[PDB]
Design a protein around this ligand. Structure first.
Ligand SMILES: Cc1cc2nc3c(=O)[nH]c(=O)nc-3n(C[C@H](O)[C@H](O)[C@H](O)COP(=O)(O)O)c2cc1C
Ligand SMILES: Cc1cc2nc3c(=O)[nH]c(=O)nc-3n(C[C@H](O)[C@H](O)[C@H](O)COP(=O)(O)O)c2cc1C
Ligand SMILES: Cc1cc2nc3c(=O)[nH]c(=O)nc-3n(C[C@H](O)[C@H](O)[C@H](O)COP(=O)(O)O)c2cc1C
Ligand SMILES: Cc1cc2nc3c(=O)[nH]c(=O)nc-3n(C[C@H](O)[C@H](O)[C@H](O)COP(=O)(O)O)c2cc1C
Lengths: 395, 389, 395, 389
C-alpha cells in the first residue's frame, strides 16, 4: 500500500539517518526502521499473532526479575565468551532465524547479516532461515570468517525428500547445527499484515512447506540421518524439554516464535526459570543445551537468561531493524551495543565470566507477579484532579 | 439525541462499510457498529451495570490464564465438534440471548441471526431472547437448516399462567432446551442508556426460588439450564435439584457490578464438581467477555461444555446482517482450529487443565494510586532522532 | 484567586445546571461542583494530604473485593434499615462531618444538609462538624423531623472548659452521639489549597483548637462527664480498635479523615477486614460498633463494608458536592441515589436485610493485591505500535 | 544543543521564578530546575542508567509500604534528632554526594550546599563528592557553622598513592567520616547525556576488594562506610570485616539497572542483622528516590540510621542556591515532624517496624500487556453534562 511517499521515506533514508556512531541502543534501530521501512516490510517484521500479548510479554517478563549484585569484587577483566553446540563463541547471544531480509535490505538481505556477524573483532553465531530471501549457499559464502559460526533453521517439508536433500546440502556447506522449528505447524495470524492486504478457510494456514504432522518420531529419525547437532526450536513447556532430553537431541530453544504463533504462550524467560531446576532434579542439565529467545533488547536481559542456565540467547527483530537501516555495519553495531551492555552489567553484577552467572545473582521472588488489574473506575478518575507543580510567574 | 446528523451515519453504513471479507476479528465488527448504530442502539448493546467493571473484567480475566502448549504432535487434522444438551454441535460455542436486534438490524432483526447461524458450512446453536424484537415462531422458521439447533431463554413471569403457556408453546416450536435467567430479579442500572434518555418488572418475577425450578422440571421434558450462576455453591445446588446445566454468567456485566468473571468461577467450581462426581451430572456453560478463539479454548480446557457470546454477534448483525453473523461464526471457528493446532491437541475432549498455566489466575490486582507529581516532572528516555532536514 | 470568571461560573450555575432528576450517580454532583465552585471552595473540599494516595486508595481498595451473589432467592422485598448507636435508622449510611459548607452553599450551608437528611421519605443520620459555618443550634433547629438523627463531631480543645461547655450544650440541644476526632492532632498538609494562597514552621500546623496532647485517659474522663454514646473517629489500626473496646466506649470510626491527614494510612475497608475477625476472636464484636468512611461512592461499596461487619458507612465529599450544586434537594437526591443503589445490589446479591449481609457474600481472596508496578519501559512502549481496527472506506 | 534560545531560560530563572516561600515540596524544585537548567546540566542530574527502571523503582517501592499509625498519643512535642556515625544530628536525613554543582549553580557550586546545610536553625550533614566542582577545602570552610558535620565520599584510585594522600588530606580538614563508593567500578551508561553529546576510569579502581577496605581501616581513624551495597550478603560482609556503616544504594539508579530499591533491601537485611546481634555493630544508611517525609519515616521505621537525598538538593541549589538548599531542608524537616505526629510517636528511637504495614512490600508487579483492540473500541462511562448554552 505504498504511495509515492515512498519518497518521504527516501528522504528519511537519505542520510537524514543519523551516523551509525550515534546509535545508543537497540531501540534506536527499531525507531528508525519504523519510519523508513516499506509499510509491508514493517508489517511483516514487527507484527505478532492476534492481540500480540505474548510478543510484548516475552520482553516484559524480564522485568519481573531483579539483580542481587556482588560488590567489592575484582572486575577489571570480564570475559563474555562461552560455548554453544560444541563451538567456542565470542558472545553469549546469537542472531535468530528470520525470513525475508530483502524486504528491509533489498540489495544484500541475509548476506549482510552474515557479514555483520563475522566481519568485526566480535563474531556472533548466525541462524540461517529457511524463509531467507537469499540461498544458504549465498549466505554461507558471504561469511567473512572461517571462525564465524552459522547454524541452519529447518522446516521439515511434507515431502521429506526435499528435507533430506536440504539437510545433506547444508552439512556439505558447513553449517554447524540444525534448528528444527516445531512451533509453526499452522501459520500464526498476524493481523497488521492482513489489514494491509485487505484494502491496500482454516486449512489455508496449513502449508506443504511446513509439515503439521511432524512428530517426536521424526526427530528421532532425523537424528540418525545427520551428524549435525539438532536443536528443537519452539519449546513452550517443561514436559517437552524433558522429552527432548529423552530422545537425546542436543538442545532446545525455549521460544514462541517472537509472539508470532500462539498468543498466550508464556514468556520463555519464565519457562526457563521453571525448567532448569527440574533439569537438575534429574541429572539432565549438562546433557541438553537450553537456548531462549523473544523480547531480548538489553544486555541485562541476556544476563538474566544466562543466570537461569540458558546456554545462549537469541534475538530476531533487533538485527532485522539494524540490517534494514544500515546493512552489514548496522548488524555489527548492534553486536557491539549488546556486547558492551553485557560487559558493563557483568562488572556491576560482580562477576567476570559466563560460567559465574548463576541463579543467586537474581532476585526471583516476584517472577510470578504477572498481573491483570481490575478495570479502572473511569468516572472516579475522570473527575479526580491530581496535585500540581508551582507554575512560574509569567511576566 | 438523534439529530438529522444521522445521515453522517447513513453515509458510514453506505458502501463506506468495508467488504465483509476484510473483517479480521470480532473487534472490527464492534468498531464499525459503534460508528453506524443509533446512539440508543449503541447505548443499549454496549452498556453494562453502574461502573462497568464486571463487564470488562469478564474479558480481562481470560488474560490471567496462559497456555502450556504441546509441540511435535500431529495436528494436521483437528475436530472442534462437541455435544451440548444431548445434541451434537459443529462448534464449542453458541449465540447467547440478547434482546432487541431490530434496533441494529431493522428489516430482519433476530431472524438474520437464525440465518447466519445456519446458512453456511458451520451450524451454531442460537439462544432466543424473551426480549427479542421478533417472535420465537418468526425466528425458528427463518432458520435455513433443520440440522441447526435452537434454545429458548425464559424469564418466568409473576403471572405463572403466562410462563406455562410460553413453555408449552416453545416445546411445540422445536427448541431443544430451556435457559432460565436467574440473575435479573431486578434489572441492572445501565447508565449510558439513562444519560441518553434525559426496577422491579412484571415480566420478571423477583420471587423465583429453587422450588420453582423443581416445579418447572416436572412440567417440561425440555432440559433446563439455570442461566446466571455466579458462585460455586449454587452450581452445586443446581446439581442437587438435578437440572441439566448452568451458565456461569453475570448477564454480560449488565446486572451486579463486582460479580466475578465467569472464567474465574469456572476454574473454582470444576475441581469441586470433580471432588463430588458431579462433573458429568451437570453441563456447565460460560459466557461474558469472549472475543477470541483462545478465550473459548481457555474455557473448554477448564471444563466448560460450551461458551456463549452476546455482543459480538449483535454487532456483526447490526453491520452486515445474516452475512455478518455467518462471518463472525467463521472468524471464531478458524481462531479455535488454528489455536488448537498450536496448543497441540486435535479434539475438544483433549482440551484439559494441564494445557493451561493457572498459576496467576488469582492475580486480580488494584495498583496503589500513581504519584502524580513524581510522574509529571520525570522525563522518560528518548529515541535517537533523524538528522536536520 | 477568582477572576470575574466568577461570571463564567454564574452562567454554569444558571440552570445550565441540568435538572436534579437528571443526576444518575454521586460522580455527577462531583463533576458539576468542579465546574461551578469557587477555586478555593473546590480546593478545600476536594484536596487530600500531600500526594493524595490515601485519598484515592480509600476508594480503590473497595475494588479489591468482589461478590459471591446468591441466586434463586426471594428478593421481592428488601429492607435496608438498621440501628446505629441505639437509634433506629432508615439506611446503613450517614453524612460524615465536614467543615465550611457555606463555601459551597453560601445562603444555607449545613442547615441545608440537615434539611436534605430529614425532609424526605428516607432519613439519614447527620454528623455535625465543629468546623461548620453554621452553629449547632442553627443546624439542629433546621432539622425537619423529630425522627431524624443528628450526631456531633468534637475536637477537644487545649482549653478543656470550652470542650466541657460544648459537650453540655450539644446534649441539651439533643444530638444523639459524640464523635471525637483523633486523627488530626496536627493539620494535614493539603497542597492544592496552599498552591492557591501562595501566588493567588511545623508548630504552625498545631492549634489550640485541636489538642495534640489528647490521650486515652481523656476519653475515659469524657465518658464519665456525659451520657451520650461516644465514638472514636479516626482509628487506623486494629490495636486501637481493641483499646477502644477496653475503655468501653460505644464505637470507633475506621477513618483516615478522607485522606486529608496521614498519607499512606491504609484504606479503612482493609482495616475493617482485618479488624472484625480479630474482634470475634475475643467476644468483642457486639460490644463496639464499627463505622467506616472514605472513598465510598457506590452502593456496592456500602454493601462491601456492611458484609465485613461495619455498623454504618459515612460519606463526606459526595454530600458537599450535592449541597454545593443543589442545596437541600441535592442532598436528598444523593440520599435517594445511594438508597436505590443499595437496594438494587442487595436483590442481586440475594439478601433482603442488613443483618443478612455477611462475609461469605464476598470474595476476599484478592483483598491484599495492593500493587505497585515496576516502572514501565518507555523506549519499548514508545516504538511499539499496537494492533488497529479496520477503517471504513472514506469516499 | 544550547541554542541562544537559552535567553528563554534566562527569562525563566529571571524574577519569573516564584518566591522561595511559595515552594511547597521537593518536586517543585525539580520542576523549576527542569525548565531553567542547561540541557547538559539537566541530562547529567536527572539521568539514570539504561532504561532508568531502578531510578524510578527506588521511589515507587516506598509506595509498597503503608502505615499503621497510633492515635490518642500525646504528640504535642516531637523530636527528630538522632546520632549518625558517632556524632549528634538535628535531622534523620543528609545530603548525599553528587558531582558538578557548578553546572546548575555556576558562581557558588557545592559551597552553597554547605551554606544551606548550616545557615539556619536546622543543621544537616553534607557528603562531599570526589566529583565536586569545588575542592573539599573550598567547601569545608564556606560552612557558616562549626556545629555542622561533613563527610567525604571517596573513589579509591588505581594509583593508591593518590588515595592515601586524599584520605590524610580530608582527615586534616575535619571530615567526620569516609564514604567509600563501591557500586561504580565501571561508570553506568546514562543515555540522556549521550544522546545530547551526539567505561573503565583511572579515577575509579575496578579491582577494589574487601581486603582493600580492611587495608583502609588500619590507615585511617575516620569511620568507614561502604556506600553502594545492594544485597544482604554484603551487608553481613561489611559487619564481619568490622566497618562502621553501609549505604544501601544503587547510585540513584545511575549504575546497574534492575538493582532493587534500597528500601526493599533494607527490609530484608535488618531482620537478618537482628538474628545475628549485628544491628548495633553496623550503621545502615539508605538513599535513592527519597522525596517525602513519609519516605524517610518508612526507612527509619525499618532500621535505617539515616537516609540520603541526592537530586532534590541539586535542584533546589540549581534554582535558589544556598537559600533553596536551606528551604529544601525545611520542607523535609516539617514533613517528618508533621507525619511523626500523625504516626503517633515522638522520637526517632520510637520509629519501629510495628508502625508499618509490610504485608504488600513484595507486590512488585508487571502487568500482562494491555488488550489494545478491546480497549480502543470500549467506551467508558460519561459524566452528566451541563445544559445547552
Ligand atoms: C520477521 C520474522 C520472521 C521469522 N521467521 C522465522 C522462521 O522462518 N523460522 C523460525 O524458526 N523462526 C522465525 N522467526 C522467529 C525467530 O527465529 C525468533 O523466535 C524471534 O525473532 C525471537 O524474538 P524477537 O524478535 O522478539 O527477538 C521469525 C521472526 C520474525 C520477527
Ligand atoms: C443487548 C443485550 C441484551 C441482553 N438480553 C438478555 C436477556 O434478555 N436475557 C438474558 O438472559 N441475557 C441477556 N443478555 C446477556 C447474554 O445472554 C450474555 O449473558 C452476555 O451477552 C454475555 O456477554 P458478552 O456480551 O460480553 O458476550 C443480553 C446482553 C446484551 C448485550
Ligand atoms: C471538606 C472536608 C472537611 C472535613 N472536616 C472534618 C472535620 O472538621 N472533622 C472530622 O472529624 N472530619 C472531617 N472531615 C472528614 C470526614 O468526616 C470524612 O472522614 C471524609 O469526608 C470521609 O471521606 P470521603 O469524603 O471520601 O467520603 C472532612 C472532610 C472533608 C472532605
Ligand atoms: C548528578 C549526580 C552525581 C552523583 N555523583 C556521585 C558520586 O560521585 N559518587 C557517589 O558515590 N554517588 C554519586 N551520586 C549518587 C548519590 O550520592 C545518591 O546515591 C543518589 O543521588 C541517591 O538518589 P536520589 O538522587 O534519587 O536521591 C550522584 C548522583 C547524582 C544525581
Amino acid at each position: 500500500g505504498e504511495t509515492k511517499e515512498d519518497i518521504a521515506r527516501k528522504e528519511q533514508l537519505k542520510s537524514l539517518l543519523p551516523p551509525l556512531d550515534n546509535i545508543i541502543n537497540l531501540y534506536d534501530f527499531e525507531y528508525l526502521a519504523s519510519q523508513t521501512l516499506t509499510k509491508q516490510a514493517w508489517a511483516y517484521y514487527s507484527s505478532g499473532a492476534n492481540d500480540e500479548v505474548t510478543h510484548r510479554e516475552n520482553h516484559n517478563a524480564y522485568h519481573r526479575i531483579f539483580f542481587k549484585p556482588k560488590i567489592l569484587v575484582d572486575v577489571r577483566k570480564v570475559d563474555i565468551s562461552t560455548d554453544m553446540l560444541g563451538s567456542h563463541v565470542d558472545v553469549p547471544f546469537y542472531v535468530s532465524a528470520t525470513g525475508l531480509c530483502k524486504l528491509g535490505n533489498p540489495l544484500e538481505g541475509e548476506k549482510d547479516v552474515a557479514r555483520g556477524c563475522g566481519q568485526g573483532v566480535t563474531k556472533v553465531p548466525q541462524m540461517i532461515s529457511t524463509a531467507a530471501s537469499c540461498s544458504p549457499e549465498e549466505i554461507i559464502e558471504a561469511a567473512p570468517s572461517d571462525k564465524q559460526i552459522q547454524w541452519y533453521q529447518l522446516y521439515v517439508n511434507s515431502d521429506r525428500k526435499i528435507t533430506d536433500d536440504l539437510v545433506k546440502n547444508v552439512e556439505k556447506l558447513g553449517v554447524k547445527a540444525l534448528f528444527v522449528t516445531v512451533d509453526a505447524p499452522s501459520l500464526g495470524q498476524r493481523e497488521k499484515d492482513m489489514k494491509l492486504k485487505f484494502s491496500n478457510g482454516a486449512s489455508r494456514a496449513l502449508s506443504k512447506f511446513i509439515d503439521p504432522s511432524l512428530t517426536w518420531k521424526d526427530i528421532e529419525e532425523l537424528k540418525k540421518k545427520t551428524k549435525l547437532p539438532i536443536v528443537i526450536k519452539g519449546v513452550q513447556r517443561t514436559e517437552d524439554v524433558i522429552k527432548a532430553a529423552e530422545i537425546g537431541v542436543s538442545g532446545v530453544v525455549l521460544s514462541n516464535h517472537g509472539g508470532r504463533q500462539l498468543d498466550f504462550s508464556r514468556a520463555p524467560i519464565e519457562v526457563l526459570a521453571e525448567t532448569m531446576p527440574i533439569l537438575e532434579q534429574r541429572n539432565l542439565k549438562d546433557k541438553l543445551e537450553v537456548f531462549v529467545d523473544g523480547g531480548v533488547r538489553r544486555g541485562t536481559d541476556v544476563l538474566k537468561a544466562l543466570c537461569l542456565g540458558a546456554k545462549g540467547v537469541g534475538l530476531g527483530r533487533p538485527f532485522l531493524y539494524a540490517n534494514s537501516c544500515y546493512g552489514r555495519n548496522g548488524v555489527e553495531k548492534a553486536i557491539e551495543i549488546l556486547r558492551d551492555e553485557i560487559e558493563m552489567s557483568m562488572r556491576l553484577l560482580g562477576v567476570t565470566s559466563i560460567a559465574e552467572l548463576k541463579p543467586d545473582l537474581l532476585d526471583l521472588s516476584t517472577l510470578k507477579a504477572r498481573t491483570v488489574g481490575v478495570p479502572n473506575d473511569v468516572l472516579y478518575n475522570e473527575v479526580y484532579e491530581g496535585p500540581t507543580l508551582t507554575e512560574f510567574e509569567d511576566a
